[PDB]
Design a protein around this ligand. Structure first.
Ligand SMILES: OC[C@H]1O[C@@H](N2CNc3c(O)ncnc32)[C@H](O)[C@@H]1O
Ligand SMILES: [Zn+2]
Length: 349
């Protein structure tokens, strides 16, 4: 009984937010770095979330383990290879992982992250490491996996570099650019750095996706679509507040990377109101189901499917339909995208 026992497509999930508590414990002791706990169980209760907190409160959880990974090549390549394994077990045939290359490096990064000590793992180096562990997992488990480099809202100076990384690793797993981080930061979507990086992505052919509407107003989503020129909208739950902007995005067939369990734990979705995804399922909108950060939300792709099934009354037909759309909205090249749609239709028969 796993809600939807059929191939799936995940377009929204962060690598640094989907690491096995066991691997975190392994590198914590191997490098001698402190950890909130010394047990996979207790470490799960410290990093994991039980009740709804907030976007700034959920983002702090990363501080507990990111230092144990960042800086180590062996750890960056391993978490990428294990990520594929996880997705292969959940029944996901195609996936798009996203992460901030700068948050995992300890060299050539202005504001050094996690108070690290200068080393040699450059940002361009973490993109290559992740490409290797992701490619190895593809041959060992049998699933297609592409990546997405993120732009941190609070750090616009890194953006232009994220764009160059997308151009250099184009198709070599990297298929797009994203803007994640603290959406509560006022005007973080208009910071010249971000705006310039997305302007170059539009003229260079780099795909785009922007975290918006998760906790901000409809104006933020409007800026990601009009000024940043996104091809997708991470979350976008608050878009319905602006009837005009929502119906316009509904006509343009804008994709909405939805994350149900995540919106409840971050406060992005008030539990006393109907979830936006319900309105999406009713309006036949383009959207996909995702996990966002399984490690911190103590969840699995099935969690979200079981949440929409029991609550919100989602049917298998809707599951096959929202997955066919995710495959159509994926940043795969035409040929590969056709192959994906050919496989799903064959398995959905
Ligand atoms: O994975 C890249 C970065 O994006 C941020 N993430 C993760 N999850 C997440 C959420 O969906 N909303 C906004 N930003 C997010 C984390 O800060 C992480 O370090
Ligand atoms: Zn996200």
């Amino acid at each position: 009984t796993p809600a939807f026992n059929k191939p799936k497509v995940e377009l929204h999930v962060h690598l640094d937010g989907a690491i096995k508590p066991e691997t975190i414990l392994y590198f914590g002791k191997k490098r001698g770095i402190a950890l909130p706990a010394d047990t996979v169980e207790e470490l799960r209760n410290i990093i994991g979330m039980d009740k709804p907190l907030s976007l700034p409160g959920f983002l702090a959880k990363f501080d507990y383990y990111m230092p144990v990974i960042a800086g180590c090549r062996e750890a960056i390549k391993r978490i990428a290879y294990e990520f594929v394994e996880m997705k292969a077990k959940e029944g996901v045939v195609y996936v798009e992982v996203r992460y901030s290359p700068h948050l995992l490096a300890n060299s050539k990064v202005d504001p050094m992250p996690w108070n690290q000590t200068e080393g040699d793992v450059t940002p361009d180096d973490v993109v290559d490491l992740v490409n290797q562990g992701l490619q190895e997992g593809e041959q060992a488990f049998g699933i297609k996996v592409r990546s997405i480099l993120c732009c941190m809202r609070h750090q616009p100076s890194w953006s232009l570099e994220v764009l160059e990384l997308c151009k250099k690793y184009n198709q070599k797993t990297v298929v797009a650019m994203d803007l994640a981080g603290d959406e509560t930061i006022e005007g973080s979507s208009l910071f010249p750095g971000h705006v310039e990086a997305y302007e170059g992505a539009v003229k260079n052919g780099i795909h785009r996706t922007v975290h918006a509407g998760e906790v901000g107003s409809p104006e933020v989503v409007r800026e990601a679509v009009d000024i940043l020129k996104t091809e997708r909208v991470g979350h976008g739950y608050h878009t319905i507040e602006d009837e005009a902007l929502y119906n316009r995005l509904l006509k343009e067939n804008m994709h909405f990377e939805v994350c149900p369990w995540s919106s409840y734990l971050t406060g992005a979705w008030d539990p006393k109101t109907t979830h936006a995804v319900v309105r999406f399922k009713n309006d036949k909108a383009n959207y996909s189901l995702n996990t966002d950060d399984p490690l911190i939300f103590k969840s699995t792709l099935d969690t979200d499917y079981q949440m929409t099934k029991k609550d919100m009354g989602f049917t298998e037909e809707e599951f096959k339909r929202l997955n066919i759309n995710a495959a159509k909205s994926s940043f795969l090249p035409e040929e590969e995208k056709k192959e994906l749609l050919e496989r799903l239709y064959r398995e959905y028969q």
